[PDB]
């Protein structure tokens, strides 16, 4: 009745010596697995020995005030609310209306996103990890900066970002208006997909920002100013002329000073948005945030911003514009962009796969209301098709059913090349990926898919093929999913646009 | 980092009314998502509204004694040890050798695996759940059984399982030999992939079993007896014919009777394998086991077993066999099987993608020796090509560099269809998947990939495209990984096959 | 400063059993064209009887 | 008979290039260094001193 | 109140080593047309032997 | 490794072979080797600035 000792405890040294393997391979590095048969070099591409692991997926976003068609919009009701808060705290006759104050209050958001963007470029460059070779150059390439310009001209970069914080910090914006705090939370922060040391990184970069473009008696028109994309090796002179183009109409201007001083008198100095200062010791560390990951997982990309120089055959006058005119819609702030654009004046046939009802996927089984409504923020569903003009139209445009305080334009992923010299590879994609009929892009699409599934809460993919004439649905792993129709997402969007632009109590 | 929004606390009623969402969709049935754009029916296949979540992945295995081509093998060392304990330390009989006793002990394992197989068939059929409509019919289809037969003949199935466990008690086998405990624990458990309510289920099913064959004085074989596959719809009479065919050459053999009485005398009645009885109240709930998941991840499917009726041009004598002959090879037990067979007389050229070194990734950052040795049990790496007997040969065969106590032949995944009946779909696949150049293979392959990535610790895939003449490597989400070469995995296989066939009930090493 | 990196890179299985053939394998793996010019065998004897 | 090497280097992710970046950050920026040379120049000076 | 901007704006390379020629450069880039009327040279001496 | 400056188009380290085990080299050969090694280093002001 005596249990004898097992084999593994009778020879523990044999077990511990056979199983001593080197784990924790550094990412940012090409790995060749080698051959197990070694005669298989006669089977050249039929044997895959490469092992590339990506590190950065940058979510490329556009900040939005929400959808707006009339004065009953939540941005216009918020303009009314904040204007009667500011006007009833400032003694005197104002010269600006409610729409001028809300357009100022959105231009200040674009300034603060610019400051967080250049401060992110600065604070990324000091990150080092031996087991992550993507730090810091892949993060800098994903933000569209030349990485050597930041190391060579470090003091000039610090002066530029501190001067942006000084010159944009001269304007006042309410701190208890969570739009600024949310956009700062997105633009300041590196997010791991998993709480490990060799984790993949998510970032948020603006695709464009809103430039003020004063018009006079015919109103106010926030225009797009495009940010540099990943792969552009932009230096400090390019970010300087971008900052100078963003502030050329409001830096030494009297109306912006009057509106800023009125916001500074209405909300106290403790009630203003504070810009972070940057020294040579400022570092942002990658943090684990499941709310970030939840809204990245349910993000749906809407496509490229339509510009005034963008050529669209059957769609004239569809450029993205936050407008204001007393002649149109009784002086309401108007913003209703059409989606499904990518440049390239033709139909991107893959956006037809975005016409299904989305799947909102969460982990676990108990979901609070705050988690559910935070996971739907980057989600945008199409509702109808935009109507062309001329009976000859190459692209296909879509109107949404509302959207949050930001929309996703793109995702950019940074991995290592499997070919020598194993430099960084840059892949830009929507949720919808078209795979045309050529022998080159099948293995390339499979490499993009295997790269994407390394990211723990990656956005759900939709893949269409050329010869198949067929889209495949959500390429993602689901745990506890529900199906969202456009009306539920529209209600959540209206609630969250109202909550971001909310002012405190007094009058 | 993100102070919480005070608007949500001041208006929690609006937040609760806006986020009342139907989560916990039961898995096992088709769901349509609908249309965000109502006019998108004009773009018929360019809009996907289907959602087919799979439930069952059955791992189809072959039980092995390890690789054996000389007397220095783990199975031959175990044969020597158990023959010394049975024949000499206890007064055993002298009409049989060590290879005969070891092949009796190997033939008993197929009986134990068959008992666990029909016991899992019986325990599955009483499982019904509102949250999982795959239960129990998809598990019963994946095991090869007609699911209406086990419902209509539940008492007959339930008593046949007990009769198998009773008639297996005519043969004695040692209980401290953890080979039997491992195979019984594998082929009976229902293994859940994530430990949630409607998670995915992994099973282990024998592809074949080893049937005992006596050649008289010129040796002793173990030949393959194929089990039913996941579309076969086999009744109880087929499983009774299989069990009668398995114990046909064992109950009338007096060599087996002498060896059985010798093992009974040497180990005692208390130290034998006891196949326990089941009653009508016997249920198996699915369990969470991260060692099983670490086995299923990094598993390597070796292909179909080769039979003596299998047609392989250029390879006439490559059927899988556990053979001993006193004239041949010092009287050693020989199991040297060729791998890479796909059940057809041609080259499955996706097995060329199994010729690179494997990746073994584990959860976390601190892996114990027990965890690393457990996670490599179903991994099998090819080492060389087999030499074709001639110059014309359509299939390409592979010799391994050792393997564990079981090799994976296949995986069978059960899912629901996306077309209008929405029935159960049965797909069988290797780790290697060939996507031939055809207009309908890419979307089907993408549906296969998306069904596979629902399973958490799934096997790593290797996809070959015929249009590109190019394979892609391990299609899996990685973690803390290593690169394994053939000698390291061979050393781990040597360690585990030595530890499984060790009987601590013996008087060895004290 | 990084002891885990050093201890993880240097975890190798020593104490190979003797009485056993060992193939080292190829480091170039194109060298199978050089059939006997590459030696991958490793035999270790155990008994010398005087 | 040996040859001194900086390690194998075919891209910027090499150990010699990472060391070049680190020593150029410490010499050029943490201490106030001159701006007429790059990180590869400083690393090749440090390699020529060996 | 803003020492970071002051530190970033005044990061200047002092302590030029003496013993070698220095060129100052051109504030006006078109002043190369005025060749000897613009002096860009800086020659600091080291030794006076009595 | 002997230092080589190419100007604006790069910077090399080229091999300088040492004497082999049959060569029977005097002190003047080792002095010529050391003078050849520090020839492109003591007159370079890039090296002086970096030093």
XYZ file of C-alpha atoms in Angstrom, chain A residues 30 48 50-54 413 415-419 425 427 440-454, chain B residues 465 470 472-473 475:
35
model
C 13.813 38.775 -38.190
C 8.509 28.844 -44.957
C 10.572 33.155 -41.727
C 9.198 34.509 -38.455
C 8.315 38.219 -38.386
C 6.438 39.687 -35.414
C 4.957 43.209 -35.706
C 1.000 48.425 -38.975
C 6.584 44.985 -38.845
C 10.017 43.729 -39.934
C 10.740 42.597 -43.487
C 11.526 38.919 -43.966
C 13.898 39.851 -46.796
C 7.574 47.463 -43.376
C 1.111 48.468 -44.257
C 1.586 38.215 -55.383
C -1.082 39.351 -52.929
C -2.470 36.033 -51.640
C 0.587 35.236 -49.507
C 0.907 38.970 -48.793
C -2.696 39.089 -47.554
C -2.052 35.989 -45.438
C 1.036 37.673 -43.973
C -1.057 40.767 -43.182
C -3.683 38.546 -41.523
C -1.140 36.639 -39.420
C 0.466 39.964 -38.489
C -2.911 41.380 -37.434
C -3.854 38.373 -35.270
C -0.704 38.966 -33.217
C -1.126 28.405 -52.227
C 4.601 29.299 -51.907
C 3.183 30.600 -45.444
C 4.566 29.678 -42.043
C -0.465 30.962 -38.799
